[PDB]
Design a protein around this ligand. Structure first.
Ligand SMILES: [Cl-]
Ligand SMILES: [Cl-]
Length: 97
């Protein structure tokens, strides 16, 4: 739509783990940040997290307050390979608008 600001979500950080309020929304062969945003927006969630190429989690608390950051969000999103869907042991966390 526009080249910058078209996505109704903002990257927070890469985290080692998720707070207990995060729950798996889906596993998907075409997982991506925009797919997970739509999944979690439909649930009314405030945050979403990508994990290990294919998994999408939704949650309501900011992991910044409770989990350590990570530099190992290195598993590409199956549905958008230039973006990382967390890592094997790390979560790419975004905030929904
Ligand atoms: Cl830019
Ligand atoms: Cl897009």
């Amino acid at each position: 739509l526009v080249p910058r600001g078209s996505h109704m979500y903002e990257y927070v950080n890469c985290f080692s783990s998720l707070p207990s309020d995060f729950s798996k929304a889906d596993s998907y062969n075409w997982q991506s940040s925009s797919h997970c945003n739509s999944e979690c927006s439909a649930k009314g969630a405030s945050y979403f997290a990508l994990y290990n190429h294919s998994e999408c989690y939704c949650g309501d608390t900011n992991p910044s307050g409770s989990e350590s950051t990570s530099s190992s969000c290195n598993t590409y999103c199956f549905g958008y390979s230039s973006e990382m869907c967390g890592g094997e042991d790390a979560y790419s966390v975004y905030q929904l608008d």
